[PDB]
Design a protein around this ligand. Sequence first.
Ligand code: HEM
Ligand code: HEM
Ligand SMILES: [Ca+2]
Lengths: 148, 144
Amino acid sequence: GAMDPDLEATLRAIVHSATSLVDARYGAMEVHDRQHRVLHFVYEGIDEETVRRIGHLPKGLGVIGLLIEDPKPLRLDDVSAHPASIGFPPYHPPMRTFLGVPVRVRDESFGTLYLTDKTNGQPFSDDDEVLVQALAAAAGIAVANARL
Amino acid sequence: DLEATLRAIVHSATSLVDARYGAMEVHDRQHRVLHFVYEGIDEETVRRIGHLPKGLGVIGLLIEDPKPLRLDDVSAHPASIGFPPYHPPMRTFLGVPVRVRDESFGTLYLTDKTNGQPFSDDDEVLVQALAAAAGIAVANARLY
Ligand code: HEM
Ligand code: HEM
Ligand SMILES: [Ca+2]
């Protein structure tokens, strides 16, 4: 089933402002069930054809899974060089710089929010980290309340 | 519980945009203030102001018709009612509806970006996104 229309709109707005304000080329969010299972995937910066070529949606594997495992922000200058990296699938754009955080309310986890390839060519900043943390907290609030 | 959530949101809007003051008012359908949460003002001044806002002037504009409002001087707008006595002076303004598609519940608003700067398109987009999450939280509270 599709997401609640208000939750969908809110989550897309959050991904867009995170992406834009942090100057990321790509931004995405995963919404989770219980036992951290991906239910929905919201993203921007990739065109429609490319999405068709990739074909399959992420399972929230690899580096993304560290955001759940270790509920702290993770910044990397070369994402796929990380030993937990599962790598990109065929047709997926290559990505280097990465900023990701768990989407949470208190101790409950609701998903993950992540940005890649800052237009700078530079790594993501502490200010970037702090802003994305705040947007993830807002996302957590939205998910927790759309749900119950 | 819900005020806490609303307080966290006000805090995020104020900090990230770097405004001196931020608040949120939530009203009922007959426009009576149900929640008023704010940031940037000490308890002594608040006591000197006395009475809470009723959602008049520029805020009443935002309630009457909900769409982003961003101004260089809040007092120069034709709908401006003025500040009450003892209220801090404030100049630059950003305000956005707190809503879901079915209904608008209130206003999230910011004043006096540090170093005297006007609020940007970027600020407006950010605050709208944070307000959207408040709208969902309010809607759910209205459903219990
Ligand atoms: C546009 C924003 C996107 C971002 C920021 C992003 C981010 C990432 C990153 C960093 C990885 C590698 C993680 C690792 O190596 O551990 C990854 C893997 C992957 N991506 Fe993307 N991606 C985006 C878009 C997409 C889209 C649109 C699709 C498909 C339509 C997709 C499908 C996949 C798949 C299947 C994987 C393999 C790992 C998994 O399934 O979890 N991605 N993504
Ligand atoms: C610190 C965050 C605050 C912000 C950002 C803020 C902002 C504003 C703005 C923009 C106006 C409208 C002025 C006009 O239309 O010309 C206003 C008026 C007013 N404010 Fe504040 N204010 C804050 C705090 C407070 C507090 C703490 C109180 C009282 C305890 C208060 C009481 C009032 C009253 C009574 C009005 C007159 C209009 C009305 O009743 O709606 N304000 N404020
Ligand atoms: Ca920028």
